[PDB]
Amino acid sequence: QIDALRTLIRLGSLHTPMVVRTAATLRLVDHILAGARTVKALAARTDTRPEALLRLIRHLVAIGLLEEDAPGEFVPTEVGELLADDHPAAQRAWHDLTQAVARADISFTRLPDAIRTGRPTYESIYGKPFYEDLAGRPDLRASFDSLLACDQDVAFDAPAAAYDWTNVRHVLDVGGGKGGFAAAIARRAPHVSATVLEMAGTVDTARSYLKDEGLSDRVDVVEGDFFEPLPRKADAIILSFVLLNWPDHDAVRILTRCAEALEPGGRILIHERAETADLHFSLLDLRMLVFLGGALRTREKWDGLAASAGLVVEEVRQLTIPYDLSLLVLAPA
Amino acid sequence: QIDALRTLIRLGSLHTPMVVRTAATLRLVDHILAGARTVKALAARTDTRPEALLRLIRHLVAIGLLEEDAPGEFVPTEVGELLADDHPAAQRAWHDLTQAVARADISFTRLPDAIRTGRPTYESIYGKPFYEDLAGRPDLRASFDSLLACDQDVAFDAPAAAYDWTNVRHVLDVGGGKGGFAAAIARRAPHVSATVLEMAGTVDTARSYLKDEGLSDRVDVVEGDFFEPLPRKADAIILSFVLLNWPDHDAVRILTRCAEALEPGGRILIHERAETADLHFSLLDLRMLVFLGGALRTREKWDGLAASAGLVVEEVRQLTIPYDLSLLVLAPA
Ligand SMILES: CC[C@@]1(O)C[C@H](O[C@H]2C[C@H](N(C)C)[C@H](O)[C@H](C)O2)c2c(cc3c(c2O)C(=O)c2c(O)cccc2C3=O)[C@H]1C(=O)OC
Ligand SMILES: CC[C@@]1(O)C[C@H](O[C@H]2C[C@H](N(C)C)[C@H](O)[C@H](C)O2)c2c(cc3c(c2O)C(=O)c2c(O)cccc2C3=O)[C@H]1C(=O)OC
Ligand SMILES: Nc1ncnc2c1ncn2[C@@H]1O[C@H](CSCC[C@H](N)C(=O)O)[C@@H](O)[C@H]1O
Ligand SMILES: Nc1ncnc2c1ncn2[C@@H]1O[C@H](CSCC[C@H](N)C(=O)O)[C@@H](O)[C@H]1O
Predict the structure, then answer these.
(1) If one looks up domain B100-148 in CATH, what number appears?
(2) CB B312 within 8 A of CB B320
(3) Which architecture, in CATH terms, is A2-94?
(4) Could A22 and B47 be called an inter-chain contact, meaning their C-beta atoms sit closer than 8 Å?
(5) Would you call A146 exposed, middle or buried from its count of C-beta atoms within 10 A (0-12, 13-18, 19+)?
């Protein structure tokens, strides 16, 4: 009743996440951590009005991201210190309006259009569809790859383990980001070679990362388009968090091109999510609707797509954050 | 540590308030309350895709606004029933993107600009400054007046009581919305007459409301502009939640025009807020920054403005939601 009003007001509140986002984009906590105690030093480091920044700090204190320690000095709280840039969970970057994802969340402001039409709303705001906007803006293209690659060192270890590489000769990582998954498979299967197929811009950072990993001998990088014939056959084609970017009819074209590049005996491996993990799942799934018109799919939806592409789901293996991921294995129907 | 990640993600989350806002704008709960049990009936009442609306409902269930009662039937929770349209707290309308305020919260998406410049960001989005956009869009103009007038029946009773009307002949309600405050003063002081000075559009709804109140005999309505000479003198000039819409230099011009329309012995009465009331206060104050470039002011800020307009603060009286309001009394310096 009395709390029913307060819970709705807090859940319906738009200023609160933009205050956090401004704080991240201003790099407020790093500037506090670099020794800006007063509001005056802090406005001067961030190029902001002193009195407008106090009003933001005041809200930041009241949502728990900041404390007034000495009168006028402001310290990050324990929640607030997750906004430091070197912090392992990368949450400052994921809330930076200057970067690709927190920029893309602005599409949620036209959420009604996406519910009415089913189509993404990103284009209405920024001019081109998600990945064309990145193709034209190298800062956003780069920002996107490092945001998604923020756990490349550990996030592919468990999926790579989950699979038997003994009879695999080559591996095709289709849209494999910076190559972290090809890298994990290389450091577990010492006899396997790999190719990463990615877009312009990303090919150069994946190559640079695989070089500095010591793996340019074993993992190549081909620039290309996975809607066209893949540049070589393989015994394993990896799609890690790719098909969720796409509506069903495009997802099928991707899976068909892979089925064609599949060698005799081959398997297609899909790495994606399953079903506060409901709030984690609901955020990613509403993000795919409003950015790209993709979706997270259930098991019965996968057999649909798979059947439509000439494939069958062999098995589903179940694998750092509170969330279980899946590894779908697909062979010719 | 583990909760530090979850608290930041929830506080930085932009989809969650837009999901609530979409639900309000779609009038989802009223349609459920009018007996749409299934998602199919519900998509057809709201003109939405069935599968996109299930994804929104799914997030609405997980933030507590909805429950799955029978498989596929969805009921509002106790929080969620605050989104019913006839509910006294009017929270459906305050979250409706079609209405003036939830439409204006979109300015919070450019929050960094307001911190850097101190200037409102509403104009950058919608073409004209806040009140010019309303002057051109009668639906928004009307929406704004009824949103602010949602407690006209009770919200002015305590301020009206707090003041002695015995020697007051006339009262000028400067920017008095739909006239609810002139109305409260009339129903307590039976010998006082009043004028409401308001903008185009609002004058007609205030007149209609004061008519249906039985008070068109005692309370007049003049259309006008409070930056120009007021249309008549008075012994009491009321500014209820007006000066917070304005930067200091404009606030002074408003107070100067009032000082001039003040009769011998007169008093200027300012009705505004004071200092989870910190979250209530911080929302209204960041709203005034991003919509109009106004601000909530402390006591020492009031003496500033007051001194600048030729006035002095006589006293401050302290007065339904968890929040204390103030009534400042101002006389010639
Ligand atoms: C924070 C959890 C997760 O990292 C899960 C998930 O990230 C997982 C797997 C991810 N992996 C695919 C490399 C990596 O290990 C990361 C640290 O954890 C995830 C996330 C976000 C995105 C995506 C995510 O996959 C996207 O794929 C994505 C995309 O393909 C295109 C545009 C945007 C995105 C994403 O924003 C994250 C998420 O669910 O946030 C709610
Ligand atoms: C919900 C609390 C309150 O009603 C207080 C406050 O509302 C109070 C006083 C208000 N009164 C001035 C008539 C009325 O009784 C209402 C029910 O409660 C308030 C509110 C909102 C606004 C405003 C508010 O004054 C505005 O004045 C305002 C404006 O002048 C111009 C544009 C927008 C607004 C507002 O959005 C509300 C608020 O603080 O929300 C956070
Ligand atoms: N038509 C296309 N051809 C090839 N790659 C594409 C593509 N459209 C999108 N992509 C790539 O698909 C990737 C999916 S998002 C990154 C996911 C990555 N596998 C990871 O798990 O970290 C993006 O990096 C994008 O550059
Ligand atoms: N230049 C101007 N002249 C007169 N009224 C104005 C004005 N600029 C804004 N206003 C009015 O000032 C009001 C302030 S908001 C409504 C507050 C009202 N007193 C209440 O307490 O309910 C608005 O209704 C708006 O129409």
Answers:
(1) 1.10.287.1350
(2) no
(3) Orthogonal Bundle (1.10)
(4) no
(5) middle
